[PDB]
Amino acid sequence: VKYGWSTLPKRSRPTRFNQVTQGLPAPTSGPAAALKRREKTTPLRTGVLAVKKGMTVFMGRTGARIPCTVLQLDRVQVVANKTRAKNGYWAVQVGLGERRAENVGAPQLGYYEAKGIPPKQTLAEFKVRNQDGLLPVGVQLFPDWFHVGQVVDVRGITRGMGFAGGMKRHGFAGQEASHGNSLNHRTIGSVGGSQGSGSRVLPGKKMPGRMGAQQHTVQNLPILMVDNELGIVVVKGAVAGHKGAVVKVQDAVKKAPPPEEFVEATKQ
Amino acid sequence: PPLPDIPEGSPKLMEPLVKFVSDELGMDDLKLLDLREIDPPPALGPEVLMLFGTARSERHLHVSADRLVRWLRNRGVTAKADGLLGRNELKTKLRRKARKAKLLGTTGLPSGADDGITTGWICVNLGTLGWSDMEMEFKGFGVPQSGTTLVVQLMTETRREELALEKLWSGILRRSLERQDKIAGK
Amino acid sequence: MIQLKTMLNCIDNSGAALVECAMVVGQKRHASIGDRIVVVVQKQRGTKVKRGDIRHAVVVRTKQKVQRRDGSVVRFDDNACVLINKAGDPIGSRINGVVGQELRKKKWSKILSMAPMQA
Amino acid sequence: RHAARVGDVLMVTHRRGGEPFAGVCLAIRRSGIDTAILLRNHLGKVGVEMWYKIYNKNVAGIEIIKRRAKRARRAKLMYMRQPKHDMGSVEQYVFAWKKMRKVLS
Amino acid sequence: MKVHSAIKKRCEHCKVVRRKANKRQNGYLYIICPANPRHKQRQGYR
RNA sequence: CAGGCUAAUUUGCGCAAGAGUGUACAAAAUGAGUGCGCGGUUUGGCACCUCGAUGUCGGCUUGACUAAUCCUCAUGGAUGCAGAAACUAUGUAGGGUACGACUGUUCGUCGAUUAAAAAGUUACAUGAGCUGGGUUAAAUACGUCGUGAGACAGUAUGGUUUCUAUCUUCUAGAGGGAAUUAGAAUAUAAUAAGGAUUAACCUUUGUACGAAAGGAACAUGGGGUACUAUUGUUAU
RNA sequence: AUAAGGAGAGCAUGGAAUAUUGUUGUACGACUGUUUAAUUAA
Ligand SMILES: [K+]
Ligand SMILES: [Mg+2]
Ligand SMILES: [Mg+2]
Ligand SMILES: [Mg+2]
Ligand SMILES: [Mg+2]
Ligand SMILES: [Mg+2]
Ligand SMILES: [Mg+2]
Ligand SMILES: [Mg+2]
Ligand SMILES: [Mg+2]
Ligand SMILES: [Mg+2]
Ligand SMILES: [Mg+2]
Ligand SMILES: [Mg+2]
Ligand SMILES: [Mg+2]
Ligand SMILES: [Mg+2]
Ligand SMILES: [Mg+2]
Ligand SMILES: [Mg+2]
Ligand SMILES: [Mg+2]
Ligand SMILES: [Mg+2]
Ligand SMILES: [Mg+2]
Ligand SMILES: [Mg+2]
Ligand SMILES: [Mg+2]
Ligand SMILES: [Mg+2]
Ligand SMILES: [Zn+2]
């Protein structure tokens, strides 16, 4: 095998010939079984691309100081809808910002040409639960897409930290400072056992290396403020990345979807 | 004997409370101290109304205290008894005690003078229930709302004499009143 | 932030003047205002506590700055505490000094019933 | 000129209770909505400092009860923690201030 | 219940049954007794 | 010295049988002297084998695995399970099992917390990763033995701890590539490999149970001095 | 024994060096010295 329990050649396409309508058991794997075991968690509605603008506090009447991060929506449009009959899952492609036509390539210039949308800066897909989550292509999403008090998840790329050691990367304790230590203060110490442990370093061993600059998701962050004119969506807590980086905001998977009235008002 | 007069201006929960702790709990002596005239608000709330009661025995106090917390819980007030051990908080203390005896072999049983399972004072702090706006001069945001704080101190006869918290807060009262007159003048 | 080997002041009329912290009870993080600790009496004041007696105490004052929920940050000039028994009942009967405002939210009504000042 | 300067003595009245805290301003951090001020006072015999957010709603009001004779030659007055320059207790200026209000009012 | 390597009937009401045998395992021999629940025994370890 | 063979012995266990204890009643618990066994931890035997050792081991760093379970989860038995606690046994190794004092050390001993402060294998797991508590010296003093040189599993103080990583493994990041196949831009699924993984407290109508003293299981809630939910407080 | 104990415009009469943990009590050797150049200075 190469990946998992399957020995099937990667160039063979037998999916259409093993159909449940012919009396075969519904497979436990595949796009169909992957969507069925994620139906509850999958967000009902699409998300928005926002730009991290900074951190502050939301001072509330009577005495509440709530640390919060500001995320700005900069011309968030709907670019494409990914259906299940065409792609294998439900999702909405969202665009953010703009880019100069010269910098956009011809393959992408003809892609926006077939939609009536100006070239965007970035693109991202947000998985929706069913066909009711697909929106018309070319509609702008404003901060009012969310409501105050709605918990969301913010996905952003964490700050880069280059080649990290063992202390900063894996929280290693290090070694002593002055009681006879010899050139080994911030080093990782032992890397394994001896002949009884395989006479090798074991896969997955924690070692120095690059840290940061990866996607990180912060779940269950309420929405404290929603200002359309400013274009901002203030969320509680911290968010991954630097100021000026694009992040993905969507409803929380571990929390119930917003009421039926809200999901319909926003669509209305 | 009679009941402690209710200071004019107390909340509507002050009259049933005094009746409850007297006619249903069985406190020997009850004295309600009006300490709502202290210039610097004490470290219990704006205006305290310490109610002092005497229990027959530590066991009676522990039951009466827990009986009062459940009586106030049926009205919305969420009181926190400072000295009332919980159901499982007592298990762990008993487990460790009995566990150590098993290992040692009953060599510390007569030496467990202080265990943390018995107390002769319980302070049921009801908190500041009724909040209202004051009247101040600020040209500032608003007025610093104040509210009456209720505190029920139930202890035994032996423990009510050692502490002597009745003469502590009484002395504090008159002191804060004399100092107040200095500012005004008369 | 009170740890092991830390020396604190006793502000109650228990007969202790200078105690040393021996254990942070119930937590791994260092004791802050309103936290329970186990101390060892190191000095006295000219049923009192004799030097060397191990008792439980509560931190009331910390030199480390403590941030309240509203953004107020309080700092004291020294670390103080009041001796208590394992039950939670003040050994002393009167507090002479100012205690932090974090004793109100951690249910220390007994310490706050000795008429201590607050900051 | 009329604003409160570092080195002056202020008095912060708290929303919940009205408990006033008086002290000499040692620092002013201007950080947008989180602007804060540091007040030092000796309560009892203990020196207690306090950072206060001026734009929070838990501070009912701030008043200047005593101004500094000469402007301080420093932005921060952290040297007032040393016994040499420690102003000590501020109760004197608080008592003298309340009297003025009562007599006038 | 008592897991013995030698299970025996201890009264007239004790019955020998093989339970928990399914398409994935062989099961164990049990001594089930409705009169006295102290006679409950099993043969084999999971 | 480690590895290898053996398993007398063990501070490693299981099963079978049942003298006996259990007011009664073998198997709730307990189990004499024994029998049949597993296993490779302690003290040994052997000697295939010259090599990092005589406390063969301690601490640090970093693990991986085992399950014969100290804590947390499910559960059978208990004239000796009323409740609570505790006992015995069956499932189960996901995550934890801390801190300090005195002891050269692990052996250990104690202090105070804690839900608990359980074990073992990996060449003391790991010194081309650290330490030197050790592993060996020459100096000196004392003690014991010897006619003496000396010896001692003695005692005390002191006493140079090398290496720029070739290969495999490993952690990261790259050059080229073969792709249903002319090659690209952008967004991407099935699937794969890993990560996260603690516990406590209040809340039962102080209820069930109990003569009383005592005192549960089940379940909900404890995100808000923002929204919202909820409980109170005053005004209409 | 320099015992100890009392003391020498702005935050500071301001850098460097002087400048080092202090005190007390034990064991051994009276003391200053000498010793295995290059692991043992006692
Ligand atoms: K070094
Ligand atoms: Mg960078
Ligand atoms: Mg370190
Ligand atoms: Mg191999
Ligand atoms: Mg190898
Ligand atoms: Mg018999
Ligand atoms: Mg078990
Ligand atoms: Mg049963
Ligand atoms: Mg039970
Ligand atoms: Mg799991
Ligand atoms: Mg070791
Ligand atoms: Mg090695
Ligand atoms: Mg010699
Ligand atoms: Mg000799
Ligand atoms: Mg030397
Ligand atoms: Mg190489
Ligand atoms: Mg996927
Ligand atoms: Mg849990
Ligand atoms: Mg509110
Ligand atoms: Mg000499
Ligand atoms: Mg030499
Ligand atoms: Mg030398
Ligand atoms: Zn039977």
Side-chain angles (χ1 to χ4, degrees), chain D residues 6 10 12-13 17 21 25-26 28 32 35 37 40 50 54 57 59 61-62 65 74 81 102-103:
Chain D
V6 76
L10 314 183
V12 194
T13 299
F21 184 88
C25 187
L26 301 184
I28 305 176
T35 308
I37 58 176
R40 190 170 166 80
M50 269 289 193
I54 65 172
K57 307 303 298 187
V59 298
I62 291 172
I65 74 188
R74 230 152 283 286
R81 299 211 199 106
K102 298 293 183 180
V103 170

PDB file of all heavy atoms in Angstrom, chain D residues 6 10 12-13 17 21 25-26 28 32 35 37 40 50 54 57 59 61-62 65 74 81 102-103:
ATOM      1  N   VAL D   6       0.701  64.923  36.064  1.00  0.00           N
ATOM      2  CA  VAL D   6       1.396  63.985  36.932  1.00  0.00           C
ATOM      3  C   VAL D   6       1.956  64.738  38.129  1.00  0.00           C
ATOM      4  O   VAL D   6       2.482  65.851  38.000  1.00  0.00           O
ATOM      5  CB  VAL D   6       2.498  63.248  36.152  1.00  0.00           C
ATOM      6  CG1 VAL D   6       3.710  64.149  35.919  1.00  0.00           C
ATOM      7  CG2 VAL D   6       2.904  61.981  36.882  1.00  0.00           C
ATOM      8  N   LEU D  10      -5.395  63.129  43.045  1.00  0.00           N
ATOM      9  CA  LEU D  10      -6.724  62.886  42.508  1.00  0.00           C
ATOM     10  C   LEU D  10      -7.563  62.100  43.512  1.00  0.00           C
ATOM     11  O   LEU D  10      -7.113  61.758  44.609  1.00  0.00           O
ATOM     12  CB  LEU D  10      -6.630  62.150  41.170  1.00  0.00           C
ATOM     13  CG  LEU D  10      -5.599  62.698  40.182  1.00  0.00           C
ATOM     14  CD1 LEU D  10      -5.651  61.925  38.878  1.00  0.00           C
ATOM     15  CD2 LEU D  10      -5.815  64.180  39.928  1.00  0.00           C
ATOM     16  N   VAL D  12     -10.604  59.036  42.955  1.00  0.00           N
ATOM     17  CA  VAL D  12     -11.433  58.228  42.069  1.00  0.00           C
ATOM     18  C   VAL D  12     -12.570  57.627  42.883  1.00  0.00           C
ATOM     19  O   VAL D  12     -12.333  56.865  43.827  1.00  0.00           O
ATOM     20  CB  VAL D  12     -10.611  57.127  41.379  1.00  0.00           C
ATOM     21  CG1 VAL D  12     -11.389  56.533  40.219  1.00  0.00           C
ATOM     22  CG2 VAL D  12      -9.272  57.671  40.903  1.00  0.00           C
ATOM     23  N   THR D  13     -13.802  57.968  42.515  1.00  0.00           N
ATOM     24  CA  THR D  13     -15.000  57.426  43.145  1.00  0.00           C
ATOM     25  C   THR D  13     -15.499  56.240  42.330  1.00  0.00           C
ATOM     26  O   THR D  13     -15.717  56.361  41.120  1.00  0.00           O
ATOM     27  CB  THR D  13     -16.090  58.493  43.253  1.00  0.00           C
ATOM     28  OG1 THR D  13     -15.624  59.574  44.070  1.00  0.00           O
ATOM     29  CG2 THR D  13     -17.357  57.916  43.868  1.00  0.00           C
ATOM     30  N   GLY D  17     -20.537  51.228  45.042  1.00  0.00           N
ATOM     31  CA  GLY D  17     -20.268  51.486  46.442  1.00  0.00           C
ATOM     32  C   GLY D  17     -19.967  52.939  46.738  1.00  0.00           C
ATOM     33  O   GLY D  17     -20.361  53.461  47.785  1.00  0.00           O
ATOM     34  N   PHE D  21     -10.899  56.414  46.301  1.00  0.00           N
ATOM     35  CA  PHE D  21      -9.473  56.156  46.457  1.00  0.00           C
ATOM     36  C   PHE D  21      -8.708  57.407  46.055  1.00  0.00           C
ATOM     37  O   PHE D  21      -8.750  57.814  44.889  1.00  0.00           O
ATOM     38  CB  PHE D  21      -9.030  54.961  45.611  1.00  0.00           C
ATOM     39  CG  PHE D  21      -7.586  54.590  45.797  1.00  0.00           C
ATOM     40  CD1 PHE D  21      -7.207  53.713  46.798  1.00  0.00           C
ATOM     41  CD2 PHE D  21      -6.609  55.122  44.975  1.00  0.00           C
ATOM     42  CE1 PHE D  21      -5.880  53.373  46.973  1.00  0.00           C
ATOM     43  CE2 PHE D  21      -5.281  54.783  45.145  1.00  0.00           C
ATOM     44  CZ  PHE D  21      -4.917  53.908  46.145  1.00  0.00           C
ATOM     45  N   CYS D  25      -0.948  61.249  41.564  1.00  0.00           N
ATOM     46  CA  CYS D  25      -0.749  60.670  40.241  1.00  0.00           C
ATOM     47  C   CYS D  25       0.739  60.543  39.937  1.00  0.00           C
ATOM     48  O   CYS D  25       1.467  61.541  39.933  1.00  0.00           O
ATOM     49  CB  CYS D  25      -1.438  61.528  39.184  1.00  0.00           C
ATOM     50  SG  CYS D  25      -1.422  60.814  37.527  1.00  0.00           S
ATOM     51  N   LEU D  26       1.191  59.313  39.681  1.00  0.00           N
ATOM     52  CA  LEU D  26       2.588  59.051  39.361  1.00  0.00           C
ATOM     53  C   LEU D  26       2.843  58.855  37.873  1.00  0.00           C
ATOM     54  O   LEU D  26       3.981  59.040  37.430  1.00  0.00           O
ATOM     55  CB  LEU D  26       3.086  57.807  40.108  1.00  0.00           C
ATOM     56  CG  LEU D  26       3.028  57.812  41.637  1.00  0.00           C
ATOM     57  CD1 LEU D  26       3.661  56.542  42.178  1.00  0.00           C
ATOM     58  CD2 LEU D  26       3.708  59.035  42.221  1.00  0.00           C
ATOM     59  N   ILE D  28       0.718  58.704  33.693  1.00  0.00           N
ATOM     60  CA  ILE D  28      -0.445  58.701  32.809  1.00  0.00           C
ATOM     61  C   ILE D  28      -0.049  57.984  31.525  1.00  0.00           C
ATOM     62  O   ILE D  28       0.786  58.487  30.764  1.00  0.00           O
ATOM     63  CB  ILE D  28      -0.946  60.120  32.506  1.00  0.00           C
ATOM     64  CG1 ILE D  28      -1.242  60.865  33.812  1.00  0.00           C
ATOM     65  CG2 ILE D  28      -2.185  60.064  31.620  1.00  0.00           C
ATOM     66  CD1 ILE D  28      -1.666  62.311  33.627  1.00  0.00           C
ATOM     67  N   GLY D  32      -5.356  55.373  23.843  1.00  0.00           N
ATOM     68  CA  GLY D  32      -6.699  55.329  23.290  1.00  0.00           C
ATOM     69  C   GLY D  32      -7.737  55.120  24.374  1.00  0.00           C
ATOM     70  O   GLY D  32      -7.812  55.873  25.350  1.00  0.00           O
ATOM     71  N   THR D  35      -6.541  54.400  28.218  1.00  0.00           N
ATOM     72  CA  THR D  35      -5.818  55.396  29.000  1.00  0.00           C
ATOM     73  C   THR D  35      -5.994  55.147  30.491  1.00  0.00           C
ATOM     74  O   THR D  35      -7.109  54.925  30.969  1.00  0.00           O
ATOM     75  CB  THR D  35      -6.312  56.800  28.642  1.00  0.00           C
ATOM     76  OG1 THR D  35      -6.272  56.979  27.221  1.00  0.00           O
ATOM     77  CG2 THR D  35      -5.461  57.866  29.319  1.00  0.00           C
ATOM     78  N   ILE D  37      -4.230  55.829  34.734  1.00  0.00           N
ATOM     79  CA  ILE D  37      -3.500  56.698  35.647  1.00  0.00           C
ATOM     80  C   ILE D  37      -3.105  55.889  36.872  1.00  0.00           C
ATOM     81  O   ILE D  37      -3.841  55.006  37.320  1.00  0.00           O
ATOM     82  CB  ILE D  37      -4.334  57.929  36.061  1.00  0.00           C
ATOM     83  CG1 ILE D  37      -5.644  57.481  36.717  1.00  0.00           C
ATOM     84  CG2 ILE D  37      -4.602  58.803  34.850  1.00  0.00           C
ATOM     85  CD1 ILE D  37      -6.492  58.610  37.252  1.00  0.00           C
ATOM     86  N   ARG D  40      -0.720  56.641  43.938  1.00  0.00           N
ATOM     87  CA  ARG D  40      -0.093  56.062  45.115  1.00  0.00           C
ATOM     88  C   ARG D  40      -0.667  56.702  46.369  1.00  0.00           C
ATOM     89  O   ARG D  40      -0.861  57.920  46.424  1.00  0.00           O
ATOM     90  CB  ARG D  40       1.424  56.250  45.087  1.00  0.00           C
ATOM     91  CG  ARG D  40       2.147  55.452  46.156  1.00  0.00           C
ATOM     92  CD  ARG D  40       3.646  55.457  45.946  1.00  0.00           C
ATOM     93  NE  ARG D  40       4.358  54.979  47.127  1.00  0.00           N
ATOM     94  CZ  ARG D  40       4.516  53.697  47.441  1.00  0.00           C
ATOM     95  NH1 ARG D  40       4.013  52.748  46.664  1.00  0.00           N
ATOM     96  NH2 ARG D  40       5.179  53.362  48.537  1.00  0.00           N
ATOM     97  N   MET D  50      -2.455  52.099  42.540  1.00  0.00           N
ATOM     98  CA  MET D  50      -3.663  51.716  41.816  1.00  0.00           C
ATOM     99  C   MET D  50      -3.615  52.273  40.403  1.00  0.00           C
ATOM    100  O   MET D  50      -3.471  53.485  40.221  1.00  0.00           O
ATOM    101  CB  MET D  50      -4.910  52.229  42.536  1.00  0.00           C
ATOM    102  CG  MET D  50      -5.509  51.261  43.538  1.00  0.00           C
ATOM    103  SD  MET D  50      -6.295  49.846  42.753  1.00  0.00           S
ATOM    104  CE  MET D  50      -7.206  49.177  44.137  1.00  0.00           C
ATOM    105  N   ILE D  54      -9.475  55.429  32.877  1.00  0.00           N
ATOM    106  CA  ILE D  54     -10.324  56.607  32.995  1.00  0.00           C
ATOM    107  C   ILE D  54     -11.583  56.491  32.150  1.00  0.00           C
ATOM    108  O   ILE D  54     -12.554  57.213  32.397  1.00  0.00           O
ATOM    109  CB  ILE D  54      -9.532  57.874  32.620  1.00  0.00           C
ATOM    110  CG1 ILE D  54      -9.136  57.848  31.140  1.00  0.00           C
ATOM    111  CG2 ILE D  54      -8.301  58.001  33.506  1.00  0.00           C
ATOM    112  CD1 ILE D  54      -8.515  59.134  30.643  1.00  0.00           C
ATOM    113  N   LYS D  57     -16.461  52.365  33.175  1.00  0.00           N
ATOM    114  CA  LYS D  57     -17.664  52.811  33.864  1.00  0.00           C
ATOM    115  C   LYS D  57     -17.662  52.461  35.345  1.00  0.00           C
ATOM    116  O   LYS D  57     -18.587  52.860  36.059  1.00  0.00           O
ATOM    117  CB  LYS D  57     -18.902  52.218  33.193  1.00  0.00           C
ATOM    118  CG  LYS D  57     -18.967  52.458  31.693  1.00  0.00           C
ATOM    119  CD  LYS D  57     -18.911  53.937  31.330  1.00  0.00           C
ATOM    120  CE  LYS D  57     -20.087  54.709  31.900  1.00  0.00           C
ATOM    121  NZ  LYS D  57     -20.123  56.109  31.396  1.00  0.00           N
ATOM    122  N   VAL D  59     -15.453  53.648  37.320  1.00  0.00           N
ATOM    123  CA  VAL D  59     -14.971  54.877  37.939  1.00  0.00           C
ATOM    124  C   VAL D  59     -16.065  55.925  37.768  1.00  0.00           C
ATOM    125  O   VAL D  59     -16.299  56.430  36.666  1.00  0.00           O
ATOM    126  CB  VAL D  59     -13.626  55.328  37.346  1.00  0.00           C
ATOM    127  CG1 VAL D  59     -12.563  54.278  37.608  1.00  0.00           C
ATOM    128  CG2 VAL D  59     -13.719  55.584  35.847  1.00  0.00           C
ATOM    129  N   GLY D  61     -16.242  58.982  39.085  1.00  0.00           N
ATOM    130  CA  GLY D  61     -15.696  60.301  38.844  1.00  0.00           C
ATOM    131  C   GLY D  61     -14.279  60.475  39.344  1.00  0.00           C
ATOM    132  O   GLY D  61     -13.856  59.801  40.287  1.00  0.00           O
ATOM    133  N   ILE D  62     -13.537  61.381  38.712  1.00  0.00           N
ATOM    134  CA  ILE D  62     -12.178  61.724  39.111  1.00  0.00           C
ATOM    135  C   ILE D  62     -12.141  63.220  39.379  1.00  0.00           C
ATOM    136  O   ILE D  62     -12.652  64.011  38.579  1.00  0.00           O
ATOM    137  CB  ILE D  62     -11.145  61.336  38.037  1.00  0.00           C
ATOM    138  CG1 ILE D  62     -11.024  59.814  37.945  1.00  0.00           C
ATOM    139  CG2 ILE D  62      -9.783  61.949  38.352  1.00  0.00           C
ATOM    140  CD1 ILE D  62     -10.180  59.325  36.782  1.00  0.00           C
ATOM    141  N   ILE D  65      -8.015  67.092  43.977  1.00  0.00           N
ATOM    142  CA  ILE D  65      -8.192  67.654  45.313  1.00  0.00           C
ATOM    143  C   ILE D  65      -7.005  68.498  45.750  1.00  0.00           C
ATOM    144  O   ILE D  65      -7.123  69.256  46.725  1.00  0.00           O
ATOM    145  CB  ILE D  65      -8.462  66.543  46.349  1.00  0.00           C
ATOM    146  CG1 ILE D  65      -7.176  65.767  46.663  1.00  0.00           C
ATOM    147  CG2 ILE D  65      -9.571  65.620  45.845  1.00  0.00           C
ATOM    148  CD1 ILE D  65      -7.381  64.524  47.522  1.00  0.00           C
ATOM    149  N   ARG D  74       9.506  65.497  35.376  1.00  0.00           N
ATOM    150  CA  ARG D  74       9.582  64.127  34.900  1.00  0.00           C
ATOM    151  C   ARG D  74       8.195  63.689  34.456  1.00  0.00           C
ATOM    152  O   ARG D  74       7.186  64.099  35.034  1.00  0.00           O
ATOM    153  CB  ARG D  74      10.109  63.184  35.987  1.00  0.00           C
ATOM    154  CG  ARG D  74      11.242  62.286  35.542  1.00  0.00           C
ATOM    155  CD  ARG D  74      12.133  61.906  36.711  1.00  0.00           C
ATOM    156  NE  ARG D  74      13.029  62.992  37.090  1.00  0.00           N
ATOM    157  CZ  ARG D  74      14.097  63.359  36.390  1.00  0.00           C
ATOM    158  NH1 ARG D  74      14.408  62.730  35.265  1.00  0.00           N
ATOM    159  NH2 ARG D  74      14.854  64.360  36.815  1.00  0.00           N
ATOM    160  N   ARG D  81       8.257  56.042  45.289  1.00  0.00           N
ATOM    161  CA  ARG D  81       8.197  54.812  46.066  1.00  0.00           C
ATOM    162  C   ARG D  81       9.288  54.745  47.123  1.00  0.00           C
ATOM    163  O   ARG D  81       9.157  53.978  48.083  1.00  0.00           O
ATOM    164  CB  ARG D  81       8.319  53.594  45.149  1.00  0.00           C
ATOM    165  CG  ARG D  81       7.220  53.468  44.117  1.00  0.00           C
ATOM    166  CD  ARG D  81       6.945  52.011  43.795  1.00  0.00           C
ATOM    167  NE  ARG D  81       6.241  51.847  42.524  1.00  0.00           N
ATOM    168  CZ  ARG D  81       6.795  51.402  41.398  1.00  0.00           C
ATOM    169  NH1 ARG D  81       8.077  51.060  41.353  1.00  0.00           N
ATOM    170  NH2 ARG D  81       6.055  51.296  40.303  1.00  0.00           N
ATOM    171  N   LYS D 102     -18.601  70.887  51.760  1.00  0.00           N
ATOM    172  CA  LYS D 102     -19.678  71.001  52.739  1.00  0.00           C
ATOM    173  C   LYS D 102     -19.942  72.458  53.097  1.00  0.00           C
ATOM    174  O   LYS D 102     -21.095  72.903  53.126  1.00  0.00           O
ATOM    175  CB  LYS D 102     -19.335  70.193  53.991  1.00  0.00           C
ATOM    176  CG  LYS D 102     -19.182  68.700  53.749  1.00  0.00           C
ATOM    177  CD  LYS D 102     -20.510  68.061  53.372  1.00  0.00           C
ATOM    178  CE  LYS D 102     -20.381  66.558  53.204  1.00  0.00           C
ATOM    179  NZ  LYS D 102     -21.680  65.926  52.842  1.00  0.00           N
ATOM    180  N   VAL D 103     -18.882  73.218  53.378  1.00  0.00           N
ATOM    181  CA  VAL D 103     -19.053  74.624  53.739  1.00  0.00           C
ATOM    182  C   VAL D 103     -19.689  75.388  52.584  1.00  0.00           C
ATOM    183  O   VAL D 103     -20.651  76.143  52.769  1.00  0.00           O
ATOM    184  CB  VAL D 103     -17.702  75.237  54.152  1.00  0.00           C
ATOM    185  CG1 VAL D 103     -17.807  76.755  54.292  1.00  0.00           C
ATOM    186  CG2 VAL D 103     -17.215  74.613  55.452  1.00  0.00           C
TER     187      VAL D 103
END
